[PDB]
Design a protein around this ligand. Structure first.
Ligand SMILES: [Ca+2]
Length: 286
């Protein structure tokens, strides 16, 4: 079991309420079965990465008080690793490690494209239709066709390349020096690790994902990236932070959090990525 408690971090504070199950599907339960102490910070998706960082620091202060641990091990997905990086940069004594899983560490090309769409920047109507349809599909899969089909796109405003480049200028710690490289494993006494994935193979071979309507949507979005290797939301290169563990899983962005409800690609054991890593962290004296 880890020395320091594990804090799972993601955006969409309302997820569990709206969807009816956790964002990290099955993962905290699996970790606890392995003896680790585990908490989840579900951060505000519709605001900036610095607002989420501040929220996460308030949560961490409260958690450190309740545990008497001196530090935490963050495991973030998507928006999560940026808020984790804010806390590690500002409050390194409180952070043992930052593990980023498909983090939007250098921006999302699909957030960039939506911004070109939102602003009417000469994107053809057929592309607009396919992007909005894909977003709607994913939204409605999770919300049970309940509610608005675009609103939750507000989450991408803080994930554009422009916004994330600004964030990275403030919080450069552990980023790669060469695009597509790795960062330093230890920066200011904090350990940084990354995982990622990119969509691979023809859709008919996907197994469980053939029952998950979000997968084909992710595949539509994947086709609009300049970076070929992408998970539907973020390019493989953009995920990099600290030391690479593994990033060639054949998984879309939400497959990597075991979604929807354990429907993932190729019979891969997503939860095992996390439990194996928690053992690795414990092996590093974290
Ligand atoms: Ca899936």
């Amino acid at each position: 079991s880890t020395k320091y408690p594990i804090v799972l971090v993601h955006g969409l504070a309302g997820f569990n309420e709206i969807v009816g199950f956790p964002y990290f599907y099955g993962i905290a339960d699996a970790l606890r079965q392995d003896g680790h102490q585990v908490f989840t910070a579900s951060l505000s998706a519709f605001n900036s990465n610095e607002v989420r960082g501040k929220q996460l620091w308030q949560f961490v202060q409260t958690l450190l008080q309740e545990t008497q641990a001196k530090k935490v091990n963050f495991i973030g997905h998507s928006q999560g690793p940026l808020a984790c990086r804010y806390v590690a940069a500002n409050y390194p004594d409180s952070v043992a490690s930052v593990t980023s899983i498909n983090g939007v560490n250098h921006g999302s090309e699909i957030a960039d494209l939506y911004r070109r769409v939102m602003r009417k920047d000469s994107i053809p109507e057929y592309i607009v239709g396919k992007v909005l349809n894909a977003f709607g599909t994913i939204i409605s899969t999770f919300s049970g066709h309940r509610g608005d089909p675009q609103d939750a796109i507000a989450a991408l405003e803080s994930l554009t390349t422009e916004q994330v480049t600004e964030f990275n200028n403030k919080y450069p710690q552990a980023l790669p020096k060469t695009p597509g490289g790795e960062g330093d494993e230890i920066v200011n006494g904090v350990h940084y690790y990354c995982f990622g994935s990119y969509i691979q193979g023809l859709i008919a071979g996907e197994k469980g994902n053939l029952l998950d309507p979000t997968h084909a949507a992710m595949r539509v979005l994947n086709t609009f990236f300049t970076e070929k290797q992408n998970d539907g939301l973020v390019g493989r290169s953009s995920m990099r932070l600290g030391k690479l563990i593994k990033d060639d899983y054949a998984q879309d962005h939400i497959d990597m959090v075991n979604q929807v409800a354990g429907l993932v690609g190729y019979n891969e054991d997503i939860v095992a990525i996390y439990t194996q890593h928690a053992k690795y962290l414990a092996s590093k004296q974290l």
